[PDB]
C-alpha cells in the first residue's frame, strides 16, 4: 500500500490477540506500546521524546501483525501517548518513505 | 527518492540561508526546529509527545528547502531534541509511506 501523510498514518496492529491502533513513525527508533501486559523476560530502559524521557520495559522477539505483515521483534511498553511503530519494525515490513 | 529506514532519515534542510540537519518524521503533525531566529510575527504554542510538552514559537509561511524541494509553511521553533520535519511539510515535498 501507499499511505498519504495528510492525516496521521494510523494502522491496526494485532499483538497477543489484542487489536490496537498504532502510528507508523519514521521519527522513532523503536516501537513503543501503551502500558499492557506481555509475557516473559524484560529489561528496563529509558527512552527520549520531544518532551523529555520515559521509563519503559523492553520485551524481545515479540510477534505482531502490522497491516497483514507478520513481524517478530523488540517492543517497548510504557506511558507513550499513542502506540508507535518505529523503524525497528517498519524495516521488517519493507516500509520506505517515498517522494 | 525512496528513503529506507535502516538508519534515522536525516536530511539537510536550508532555511534563511542556513544549512541544518533534520529528521523526516511521519509521527509528527508539525515541523519543529531547534532555537533560531526567524523573521516576522509569531505565536506561542504548546506541543506534546513522548515525555510531555514543550513551549514553542509558531511562525507562518516560512520558506524552507528540503532535499532540494522548495516548500513554504508553518515552522515551530523551540527546545526539540532534534530538528523535525513533520507532516505539514512532508506532504508538500510529496512524501508517502510505501510497503
Amino acid at each position: 500500500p501507499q499511505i498519504t501523510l495528510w492525516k496521521r498514518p494510523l494502522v491496526t496492529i494485532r499483538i497477543g490477540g489484542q487489536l490496537k491502533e498504532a502510528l507508523l513513525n519514521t521519527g522513532a527508533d523503536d516501537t513503543v506500546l501503551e502500558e499492557m501486559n506481555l509475557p516473559g523476560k524484560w529489561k528496563p530502559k529509558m527512552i527520549g521524546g520531544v518532551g523529555g524521557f520515559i521509563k519503559v520495559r523492553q520485551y524481545d522477539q515479540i510477534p505482531i501483525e502490522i497491516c497483514g505483515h507478520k513481524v517478530i521483534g523488540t517492543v517497548l511498553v510504557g506511558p507513550t501517548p499513542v502506540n508507535i511503530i518505529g523503524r525497528n519494525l517498519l524495516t521488517q515490513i519493507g516500509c520506505t518513505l517515498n517522494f | 527518492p525512496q528513503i529506507t529506514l535502516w538508519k534515522r532519515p536525516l536530511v539537510t534542510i536550508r532555511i534563511g540561508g542556513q544549512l541544518k540537519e533534520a529528521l523526516l518524521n511521519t509521527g509528527a503533525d508539525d515541523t519543529v526546529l531547534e532555537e533560531m531566529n526567524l523573521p516576522g510575527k509569531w505565536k506561542p504554542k504548546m506541543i506534546g509527545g513522548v515525555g510531555g510538552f514543550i513551549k514553542v514559537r509558531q511562525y507562518d509561511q516560512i520558506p524552507i528547502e528540503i532535499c532540494g524541494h522548495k516548500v513554504i509553511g508553518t515552522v515551530l521553533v523551540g527546545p526539540t531534541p532534534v530538528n523535525i520535519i513533520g507532516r505539514n511539510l512532508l506532504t508538500q515535498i510529496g512524501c508517502t509511506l510505501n510497503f
Binding site: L23, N25, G27, A28, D29, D30, V32, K45, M46, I47, G48, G49, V50, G51, T80, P81, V82, I84, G86 | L23, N25, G27, A28, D29, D30, V32, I47, G48, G49, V50, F53, T80, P81, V82, I84, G86
Partner: peptide
Amino acid sequence: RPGNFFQSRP
C-alpha cells in the same frame, strides 16, 4: 492531543 512522537533509543 499531543502531536510530535519523535522517539530516541537509550
